[PDB]
Short mmCIF file of N, CA and C and ligand atoms in Angstrom, two decimals:
data_model
loop_
_atom_site.label_atom_id
_atom_site.label_comp_id
_atom_site.label_asym_id
_atom_site.label_seq_id
_atom_site.Cartn_x
_atom_site.Cartn_y
_atom_site.Cartn_z
N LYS A 1 20.39 45.79 -127.81
CA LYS A 1 18.99 45.78 -128.19
C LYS A 1 18.22 46.93 -127.52
N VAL A 2 17.38 47.53 -128.33
CA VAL A 2 16.52 48.65 -127.86
C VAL A 2 15.10 48.07 -127.83
N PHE A 3 14.63 47.87 -126.61
CA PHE A 3 13.31 47.32 -126.33
C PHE A 3 12.17 48.32 -126.52
N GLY A 4 11.01 47.78 -126.85
CA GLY A 4 9.78 48.62 -127.02
C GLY A 4 9.18 48.64 -125.58
N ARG A 5 8.40 49.63 -125.26
CA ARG A 5 7.78 49.78 -123.94
C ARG A 5 7.08 48.51 -123.50
N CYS A 6 6.07 48.10 -124.25
CA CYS A 6 5.27 46.88 -123.96
C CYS A 6 6.12 45.65 -123.94
N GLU A 7 6.99 45.54 -124.93
CA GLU A 7 7.91 44.42 -125.04
C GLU A 7 8.67 44.18 -123.74
N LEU A 8 9.24 45.27 -123.22
CA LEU A 8 10.02 45.22 -121.98
C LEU A 8 9.17 44.84 -120.79
N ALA A 9 8.00 45.45 -120.73
CA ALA A 9 7.03 45.21 -119.67
C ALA A 9 6.77 43.70 -119.56
N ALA A 10 6.52 43.12 -120.72
CA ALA A 10 6.24 41.68 -120.84
C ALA A 10 7.41 40.82 -120.41
N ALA A 11 8.61 41.26 -120.81
CA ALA A 11 9.84 40.53 -120.48
C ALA A 11 10.15 40.57 -119.00
N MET A 12 9.82 41.70 -118.38
CA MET A 12 10.09 41.84 -116.93
C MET A 12 9.04 41.02 -116.18
N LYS A 13 7.80 41.12 -116.63
CA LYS A 13 6.69 40.40 -116.01
C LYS A 13 6.99 38.90 -115.95
N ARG A 14 7.49 38.38 -117.05
CA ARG A 14 7.79 36.91 -117.09
C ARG A 14 8.98 36.55 -116.24
N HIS A 15 9.79 37.56 -115.91
CA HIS A 15 11.00 37.34 -115.09
C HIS A 15 10.79 37.62 -113.62
N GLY A 16 9.55 37.76 -113.19
CA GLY A 16 9.13 37.98 -111.85
C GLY A 16 9.16 39.31 -111.20
N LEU A 17 9.23 40.39 -111.95
CA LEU A 17 9.29 41.76 -111.40
C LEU A 17 7.98 42.41 -111.06
N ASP A 18 6.86 42.05 -111.64
CA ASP A 18 5.57 42.69 -111.28
C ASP A 18 5.48 42.25 -109.81
N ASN A 19 5.49 43.35 -108.98
CA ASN A 19 5.32 43.39 -107.54
C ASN A 19 6.44 42.68 -106.73
N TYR A 20 7.66 42.61 -107.30
CA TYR A 20 8.81 42.01 -106.55
C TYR A 20 9.20 43.03 -105.46
N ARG A 21 9.03 42.58 -104.24
CA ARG A 21 9.30 43.37 -103.02
C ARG A 21 8.38 44.58 -102.94
N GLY A 22 7.17 44.43 -103.43
CA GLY A 22 6.14 45.43 -103.46
C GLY A 22 6.20 46.49 -104.52
N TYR A 23 7.07 46.39 -105.50
CA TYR A 23 7.22 47.37 -106.58
C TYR A 23 6.48 46.92 -107.85
N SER A 24 5.46 47.67 -108.20
CA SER A 24 4.62 47.41 -109.39
C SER A 24 5.46 47.53 -110.67
N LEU A 25 5.00 46.83 -111.70
CA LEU A 25 5.62 46.77 -113.01
C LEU A 25 5.96 48.14 -113.59
N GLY A 26 5.07 49.09 -113.37
CA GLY A 26 5.25 50.46 -113.86
C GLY A 26 6.55 51.05 -113.34
N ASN A 27 6.92 50.72 -112.11
CA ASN A 27 8.15 51.21 -111.47
C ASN A 27 9.41 50.81 -112.25
N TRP A 28 9.51 49.54 -112.54
CA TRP A 28 10.62 48.92 -113.27
C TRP A 28 10.75 49.45 -114.69
N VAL A 29 9.63 49.56 -115.37
CA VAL A 29 9.63 50.06 -116.77
C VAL A 29 10.09 51.51 -116.79
N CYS A 30 9.55 52.28 -115.86
CA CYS A 30 9.86 53.70 -115.72
C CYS A 30 11.35 53.87 -115.41
N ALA A 31 11.84 53.05 -114.49
CA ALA A 31 13.27 53.08 -114.11
C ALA A 31 14.14 52.79 -115.33
N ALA A 32 13.82 51.75 -116.08
CA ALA A 32 14.59 51.36 -117.28
C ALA A 32 14.59 52.48 -118.33
N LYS A 33 13.45 53.10 -118.50
CA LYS A 33 13.27 54.20 -119.44
C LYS A 33 14.25 55.34 -119.14
N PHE A 34 14.23 55.77 -117.89
CA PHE A 34 15.11 56.92 -117.50
C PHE A 34 16.53 56.54 -117.29
N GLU A 35 16.81 55.29 -116.98
CA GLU A 35 18.21 54.87 -116.79
C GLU A 35 18.96 54.64 -118.08
N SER A 36 18.37 53.91 -119.01
CA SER A 36 19.02 53.57 -120.28
C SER A 36 18.26 53.82 -121.55
N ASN A 37 17.06 54.34 -121.49
CA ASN A 37 16.21 54.60 -122.65
C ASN A 37 15.90 53.28 -123.36
N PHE A 38 15.76 52.25 -122.55
CA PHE A 38 15.45 50.89 -122.94
C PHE A 38 16.52 50.21 -123.79
N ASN A 39 17.71 50.71 -123.71
CA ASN A 39 18.86 50.17 -124.48
C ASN A 39 19.70 49.29 -123.58
N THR A 40 19.79 48.02 -123.96
CA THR A 40 20.56 47.04 -123.21
C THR A 40 22.07 47.33 -123.27
N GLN A 41 22.50 48.04 -124.29
CA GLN A 41 23.94 48.33 -124.46
C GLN A 41 24.43 49.59 -123.80
N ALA A 42 23.57 50.31 -123.12
CA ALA A 42 23.93 51.57 -122.44
C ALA A 42 25.00 51.40 -121.36
N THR A 43 25.93 52.37 -121.39
CA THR A 43 27.04 52.43 -120.44
C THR A 43 27.28 53.91 -120.09
N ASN A 44 27.64 54.13 -118.85
CA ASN A 44 27.94 55.47 -118.33
C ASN A 44 29.00 55.39 -117.22
N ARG A 45 30.04 56.19 -117.41
CA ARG A 45 31.15 56.25 -116.42
C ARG A 45 30.85 57.33 -115.39
N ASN A 46 31.21 57.05 -114.15
CA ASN A 46 31.02 57.94 -113.00
C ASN A 46 32.37 58.49 -112.50
N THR A 47 32.23 59.53 -111.70
CA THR A 47 33.32 60.27 -111.08
C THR A 47 34.25 59.42 -110.24
N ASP A 48 33.69 58.43 -109.58
CA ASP A 48 34.46 57.51 -108.71
C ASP A 48 35.18 56.43 -109.50
N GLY A 49 35.13 56.50 -110.82
CA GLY A 49 35.79 55.52 -111.67
C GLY A 49 34.99 54.27 -111.96
N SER A 50 33.81 54.15 -111.38
CA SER A 50 32.93 52.99 -111.62
C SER A 50 32.17 53.31 -112.93
N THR A 51 31.50 52.33 -113.46
CA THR A 51 30.71 52.41 -114.69
C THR A 51 29.35 51.74 -114.47
N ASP A 52 28.34 52.32 -115.08
CA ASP A 52 26.96 51.79 -114.98
C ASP A 52 26.70 50.99 -116.27
N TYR A 53 26.12 49.80 -116.13
CA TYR A 53 25.85 48.94 -117.25
C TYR A 53 24.46 48.38 -117.48
N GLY A 54 24.07 48.41 -118.75
CA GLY A 54 22.83 47.91 -119.27
C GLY A 54 21.57 48.67 -119.02
N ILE A 55 20.48 47.96 -119.32
CA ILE A 55 19.10 48.43 -119.21
C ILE A 55 18.78 49.03 -117.86
N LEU A 56 19.38 48.49 -116.80
CA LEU A 56 19.12 49.00 -115.44
C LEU A 56 20.30 49.75 -114.87
N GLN A 57 21.24 50.07 -115.73
CA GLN A 57 22.45 50.82 -115.35
C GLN A 57 22.99 50.41 -113.98
N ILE A 58 23.35 49.15 -113.90
CA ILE A 58 23.92 48.51 -112.67
C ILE A 58 25.39 48.92 -112.54
N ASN A 59 25.76 49.34 -111.34
CA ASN A 59 27.08 49.84 -110.97
C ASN A 59 28.15 48.80 -110.68
N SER A 60 29.31 49.06 -111.30
CA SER A 60 30.49 48.21 -111.20
C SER A 60 31.23 48.26 -109.88
N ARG A 61 30.95 49.23 -109.06
CA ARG A 61 31.66 49.33 -107.74
C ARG A 61 31.03 48.38 -106.74
N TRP A 62 29.78 48.00 -106.99
CA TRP A 62 29.06 47.11 -106.11
C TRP A 62 28.56 45.78 -106.61
N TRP A 63 27.96 45.79 -107.80
CA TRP A 63 27.33 44.59 -108.35
C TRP A 63 27.95 43.74 -109.38
N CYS A 64 28.87 44.25 -110.14
CA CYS A 64 29.52 43.45 -111.21
C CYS A 64 30.96 43.85 -111.39
N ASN A 65 31.73 42.94 -111.97
CA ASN A 65 33.15 43.15 -112.22
C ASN A 65 33.41 43.46 -113.71
N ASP A 66 34.14 44.55 -113.88
CA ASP A 66 34.53 45.04 -115.22
C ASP A 66 36.06 45.16 -115.33
N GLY A 67 36.71 44.61 -114.33
CA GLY A 67 38.14 44.57 -114.14
C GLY A 67 38.79 45.94 -114.14
N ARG A 68 38.01 46.98 -113.94
CA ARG A 68 38.60 48.37 -113.94
C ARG A 68 38.12 49.23 -112.81
N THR A 69 37.44 48.68 -111.83
CA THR A 69 36.92 49.47 -110.65
C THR A 69 37.75 48.93 -109.54
N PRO A 70 38.49 49.83 -108.90
CA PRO A 70 39.52 49.47 -107.93
C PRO A 70 39.06 48.55 -106.82
N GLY A 71 38.68 49.13 -105.74
CA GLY A 71 38.23 48.35 -104.61
C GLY A 71 36.76 48.32 -104.68
N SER A 72 36.41 47.13 -105.53
CA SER A 72 34.99 46.66 -105.97
C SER A 72 34.57 45.32 -105.40
N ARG A 73 33.25 45.29 -105.28
CA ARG A 73 32.49 44.14 -104.78
C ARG A 73 31.76 43.67 -106.06
N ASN A 74 31.53 42.41 -106.07
CA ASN A 74 30.85 41.78 -107.27
C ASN A 74 29.77 40.94 -106.61
N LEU A 75 28.83 41.70 -106.04
CA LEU A 75 27.71 41.08 -105.30
C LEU A 75 26.83 40.18 -106.12
N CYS A 76 26.72 40.44 -107.41
CA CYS A 76 25.88 39.60 -108.29
C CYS A 76 26.74 38.49 -108.90
N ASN A 77 28.02 38.52 -108.58
CA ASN A 77 29.00 37.51 -109.08
C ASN A 77 28.80 37.40 -110.60
N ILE A 78 29.18 38.49 -111.29
CA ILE A 78 29.02 38.55 -112.74
C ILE A 78 29.82 39.65 -113.42
N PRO A 79 30.38 39.29 -114.56
CA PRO A 79 31.15 40.26 -115.37
C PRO A 79 30.12 41.28 -115.85
N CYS A 80 30.45 42.54 -115.75
CA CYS A 80 29.54 43.62 -116.18
C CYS A 80 29.01 43.46 -117.59
N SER A 81 29.84 42.91 -118.46
CA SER A 81 29.51 42.69 -119.87
C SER A 81 28.28 41.83 -120.05
N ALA A 82 28.06 40.95 -119.09
CA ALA A 82 26.92 40.04 -119.07
C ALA A 82 25.58 40.79 -119.00
N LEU A 83 25.64 42.02 -118.51
CA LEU A 83 24.45 42.86 -118.37
C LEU A 83 24.12 43.67 -119.61
N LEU A 84 24.89 43.53 -120.67
CA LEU A 84 24.64 44.30 -121.90
C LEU A 84 24.02 43.46 -123.01
N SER A 85 23.60 42.28 -122.68
CA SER A 85 22.98 41.33 -123.61
C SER A 85 21.53 41.66 -123.90
N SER A 86 21.06 41.18 -125.04
CA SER A 86 19.65 41.36 -125.49
C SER A 86 18.73 40.57 -124.56
N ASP A 87 19.29 39.55 -123.94
CA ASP A 87 18.57 38.68 -122.97
C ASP A 87 18.73 39.35 -121.60
N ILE A 88 17.65 39.89 -121.07
CA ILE A 88 17.69 40.60 -119.78
C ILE A 88 17.73 39.74 -118.54
N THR A 89 17.87 38.46 -118.67
CA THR A 89 17.91 37.58 -117.49
C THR A 89 18.93 37.98 -116.44
N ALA A 90 20.14 38.24 -116.86
CA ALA A 90 21.22 38.62 -115.94
C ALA A 90 20.88 39.88 -115.16
N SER A 91 20.44 40.88 -115.89
CA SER A 91 20.07 42.19 -115.35
C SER A 91 18.98 42.08 -114.30
N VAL A 92 17.93 41.36 -114.63
CA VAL A 92 16.79 41.18 -113.71
C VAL A 92 17.19 40.42 -112.46
N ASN A 93 18.00 39.39 -112.60
CA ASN A 93 18.42 38.58 -111.43
C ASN A 93 19.28 39.42 -110.49
N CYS A 94 20.08 40.29 -111.09
CA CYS A 94 20.96 41.18 -110.31
C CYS A 94 20.10 42.24 -109.61
N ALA A 95 19.14 42.76 -110.36
CA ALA A 95 18.20 43.79 -109.87
C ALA A 95 17.47 43.33 -108.62
N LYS A 96 17.06 42.07 -108.66
CA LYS A 96 16.33 41.44 -107.54
C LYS A 96 17.17 41.53 -106.28
N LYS A 97 18.46 41.30 -106.47
CA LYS A 97 19.44 41.35 -105.37
C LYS A 97 19.56 42.78 -104.85
N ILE A 98 19.65 43.73 -105.77
CA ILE A 98 19.79 45.15 -105.44
C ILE A 98 18.60 45.70 -104.66
N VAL A 99 17.42 45.50 -105.20
CA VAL A 99 16.18 46.00 -104.59
C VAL A 99 15.93 45.43 -103.21
N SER A 100 16.48 44.28 -102.90
CA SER A 100 16.31 43.64 -101.60
C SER A 100 17.37 44.02 -100.58
N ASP A 101 18.28 44.93 -100.90
CA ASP A 101 19.36 45.32 -99.99
C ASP A 101 19.05 46.31 -98.89
N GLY A 102 17.93 46.99 -98.92
CA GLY A 102 17.61 47.94 -97.85
C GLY A 102 17.19 49.31 -98.26
N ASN A 103 17.56 49.75 -99.44
CA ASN A 103 17.15 51.12 -99.89
C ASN A 103 16.11 50.96 -100.99
N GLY A 104 15.68 49.73 -101.22
CA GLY A 104 14.67 49.41 -102.25
C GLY A 104 15.13 49.99 -103.59
N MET A 105 14.16 50.49 -104.33
CA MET A 105 14.38 51.09 -105.65
C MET A 105 15.11 52.43 -105.57
N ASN A 106 15.37 52.94 -104.39
CA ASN A 106 16.09 54.23 -104.23
C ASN A 106 17.53 54.08 -104.77
N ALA A 107 17.95 52.85 -104.97
CA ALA A 107 19.26 52.49 -105.51
C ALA A 107 19.38 52.98 -106.96
N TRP A 108 18.26 53.28 -107.59
CA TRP A 108 18.20 53.79 -108.97
C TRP A 108 17.89 55.29 -108.92
N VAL A 109 18.94 56.08 -109.13
CA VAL A 109 18.82 57.54 -109.12
C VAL A 109 17.70 58.04 -110.04
N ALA A 110 17.63 57.52 -111.25
CA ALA A 110 16.59 57.94 -112.21
C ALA A 110 15.20 57.64 -111.66
N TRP A 111 15.09 56.53 -110.95
CA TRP A 111 13.84 56.10 -110.34
C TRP A 111 13.39 57.08 -109.23
N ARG A 112 14.33 57.36 -108.35
CA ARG A 112 14.12 58.24 -107.20
C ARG A 112 13.63 59.62 -107.62
N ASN A 113 14.27 60.21 -108.60
CA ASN A 113 13.94 61.53 -109.10
C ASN A 113 12.89 61.68 -110.18
N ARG A 114 12.57 60.65 -110.93
CA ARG A 114 11.60 60.77 -112.02
C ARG A 114 10.45 59.81 -112.03
N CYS A 115 10.47 58.83 -111.15
CA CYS A 115 9.41 57.83 -111.08
C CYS A 115 8.68 57.76 -109.76
N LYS A 116 9.48 57.79 -108.71
CA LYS A 116 8.97 57.74 -107.33
C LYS A 116 7.91 58.83 -107.14
N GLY A 117 6.76 58.42 -106.65
CA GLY A 117 5.63 59.29 -106.39
C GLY A 117 4.87 59.76 -107.60
N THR A 118 5.11 59.19 -108.76
CA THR A 118 4.40 59.55 -110.00
C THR A 118 3.42 58.39 -110.27
N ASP A 119 2.59 58.56 -111.28
CA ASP A 119 1.62 57.48 -111.61
C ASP A 119 2.35 56.57 -112.61
N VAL A 120 3.13 55.69 -112.02
CA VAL A 120 3.93 54.70 -112.80
C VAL A 120 3.04 53.80 -113.63
N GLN A 121 1.78 53.65 -113.24
CA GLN A 121 0.82 52.81 -113.94
C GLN A 121 0.66 53.18 -115.40
N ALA A 122 1.02 54.41 -115.73
CA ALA A 122 0.95 54.92 -117.10
C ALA A 122 1.96 54.19 -118.00
N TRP A 123 3.02 53.68 -117.38
CA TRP A 123 4.07 52.97 -118.17
C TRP A 123 3.62 51.69 -118.80
N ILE A 124 2.62 51.06 -118.23
CA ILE A 124 2.08 49.80 -118.78
C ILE A 124 0.80 50.03 -119.58
N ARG A 125 0.40 51.25 -119.91
CA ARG A 125 -0.81 51.61 -120.66
C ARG A 125 -0.84 51.11 -122.12
N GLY A 126 -1.83 50.23 -122.30
CA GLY A 126 -2.09 49.60 -123.60
C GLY A 126 -1.35 48.31 -123.82
N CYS A 127 -0.61 47.86 -122.83
CA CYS A 127 0.17 46.62 -122.91
C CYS A 127 -0.70 45.39 -122.75
N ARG A 128 -0.31 44.35 -123.47
CA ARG A 128 -0.95 43.04 -123.48
C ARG A 128 -0.19 42.14 -122.49
N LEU A 129 -0.61 42.21 -121.25
CA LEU A 129 0.01 41.44 -120.16
C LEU A 129 -0.95 40.51 -119.43
C1 LIG B 201 21.66 50.39 -110.03
C2 LIG B 201 22.90 50.69 -109.27
O1 LIG B 201 23.88 50.10 -109.35
N1 LIG B 201 22.78 51.75 -108.43
C3 LIG B 201 23.86 52.20 -107.52
C4 LIG B 201 23.55 51.86 -106.08
O2 LIG B 201 23.64 50.46 -105.81
C5 LIG B 201 24.61 52.57 -105.17
O3 LIG B 201 24.01 52.52 -103.72
C6 LIG B 201 24.61 51.79 -102.58
O4 LIG B 201 24.05 50.42 -102.57
C7 LIG B 201 24.85 49.71 -101.55
C8 LIG B 201 24.48 48.26 -101.56
O5 LIG B 201 22.97 48.19 -101.57
C9 LIG B 201 24.40 50.38 -100.16
O6 LIG B 201 24.86 49.47 -99.12
C10 LIG B 201 24.30 48.72 -98.00
O7 LIG B 201 23.30 49.51 -97.32
C11 LIG B 201 22.44 48.67 -96.55
C12 LIG B 201 21.45 49.60 -95.86
O8 LIG B 201 21.24 50.83 -96.62
C13 LIG B 201 23.28 47.87 -95.52
O9 LIG B 201 22.38 46.87 -94.94
C14 LIG B 201 24.53 47.16 -96.10
O10 LIG B 201 25.41 46.83 -95.00
C15 LIG B 201 25.28 48.04 -97.05
N2 LIG B 201 26.19 47.22 -97.97
C16 LIG B 201 27.53 47.40 -98.03
C17 LIG B 201 28.28 46.26 -98.63
O11 LIG B 201 28.03 48.36 -97.63
C18 LIG B 201 24.93 51.85 -100.00
O12 LIG B 201 24.51 52.47 -98.77
C19 LIG B 201 24.27 52.61 -101.19
N3 LIG B 201 24.78 53.98 -101.22
C20 LIG B 201 24.11 55.05 -100.73
C21 LIG B 201 24.87 56.34 -100.76
O13 LIG B 201 23.03 54.96 -100.32
C22 LIG B 201 24.98 54.02 -105.51
C23 LIG B 201 26.20 54.52 -104.79
O14 LIG B 201 27.47 53.84 -105.23
O15 LIG B 201 25.29 54.07 -106.96
C24 LIG B 201 24.04 53.73 -107.67
O16 LIG B 201 24.34 53.94 -109.05
#
């Protein structure tokens, strides 16, 4: 599923992300935009053999099991495939775990380089929230 900007904003808001660990809604929407272009089915393979999955491009070496990443942790205790669903519940619950680990949203490369220090508030412009 390819989410609309406002649509996603609303879905994240209802799932508890507006201001989760001090990160405003604009941050999450912006991160999703640059990570997967709002596509829940997005996948990307990395040099270390791990793969990034879904709307938040969650990594298989740390957060989910895809049965193909060698010496992997499955911190969210979930098959990576579960993160490619139209229902973002899995992704958001995993994200909550990630953002609370110590590097905050810096865990999202796209976020660090294209969202951090920008006016993320623009991402929720015109939304009915
Ligand atoms: C969205 C996504 O998957 N992004 C990937 C990042 O998760 C990943 O970064 C690494 O995250 C792990 C777990 O949060 C970092 O580990 C922990 O670091 C904290 C303090 O920084 C410490 O308290 C924990 O002991 C330690 N956990 C373990 C089990 O070691 C790790 O430092 C992050 N890596 C770096 C270089 O900062 C990166 C890298 O695989 O990929 C993103 O795609």
